[PDB]
Write a protein that binds this ligand. Sequence first.
Ligand SMILES: Cc1cn([C@H]2C[C@H](O)[C@@H](COP(=O)(O)OP(=O)(O)O)O2)c(=O)[nH]c1=O
Ligand SMILES: Cc1cn([C@H]2C[C@H](O)[C@@H](COP(=O)(O)OP(=O)(O)O)O2)c(=O)[nH]c1=O
Ligand SMILES: [Cl-]
Lengths: 135, 134
Amino acid sequence: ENKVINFKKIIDSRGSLVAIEENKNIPFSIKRVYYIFDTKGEEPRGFHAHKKLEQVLVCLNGSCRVILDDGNIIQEITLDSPAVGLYVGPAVWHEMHDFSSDCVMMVLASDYYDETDYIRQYDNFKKYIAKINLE
Amino acid sequence: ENKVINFKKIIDSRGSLVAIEENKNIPFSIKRVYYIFDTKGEEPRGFHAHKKLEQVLVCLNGSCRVILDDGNIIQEITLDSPAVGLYVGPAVWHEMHDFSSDCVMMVLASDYYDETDYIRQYDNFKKYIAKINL
Ligand SMILES: Cc1cn([C@H]2C[C@H](O)[C@@H](COP(=O)(O)OP(=O)(O)O)O2)c(=O)[nH]c1=O
Ligand SMILES: Cc1cn([C@H]2C[C@H](O)[C@@H](COP(=O)(O)OP(=O)(O)O)O2)c(=O)[nH]c1=O
Ligand SMILES: [Cl-]
């Protein structure tokens, strides 16, 4: 509804195509595109929140299980369709689990990588969330 | 004239990561990100040049054979690594062939989809180039 994006998909005799356009079918300007591949092991990814960064996760091949925690409710979704994007706004703790061996996870981000824009401690995230609330 | 971009790749026990940043490891601002998947058939694609659009092609899974023609030289390059991008500037004809069944082709574009920016006839592409040349 608010976080799951169903992109329009073109299908023809040659295959399938999806086009994501900044500020068109995604709410922000794209500054970075990163992707995860050649995955292995049973240790997950993520476990942090951002203060300003906006992202849209898309599973281009295989599947992956994503968890979002906005400090109020926890949501979970299994991404396994390239036509499905998951919006991860600022102030949202997130985690990525169960990457299939053939998984390819693509992320569209509103800004360049920035080590300082991370909240890696859950309690801190929680605190952070509390403060924002007050305001 | 080289068009291959080798991206820095992060590796750990969990897998690999590559990060593309507009105007940082690619020469333009990204306005669109499109991808081709669930491919079939024996028909190749592309077979056009753009007048304004700049793009970076990346084979995120499987493989595919790309043909680039800049009007000076024709280059055939097989993409089978997510860490390699192929820069397709304006006025550059491109074709994509031999898509693996599990292929995933991702493209970073400098602008929104625009059918009017498609030069669809090789001869016209060549004429366009000639024009540019003078
Ligand atoms: C997401 C991202 C990470 N990185 C770097 C930062 C680290 O050195 C490495 C991995 O970052 P990341 O994998 O997100 O951090 P963590 O190990 O805490 O889960 O890749 C970039 O250079 N660019 C990016 O866009
Ligand atoms: C590349 C792209 C294609 N499309 C559509 C146009 C076509 O209907 C289809 C395939 O486009 P494309 O292969 O570029 O054109 P063509 O098949 O004529 O050679 O996908 C978009 O809607 N947005 C995009 O960003
Ligand atoms: Cl579900």
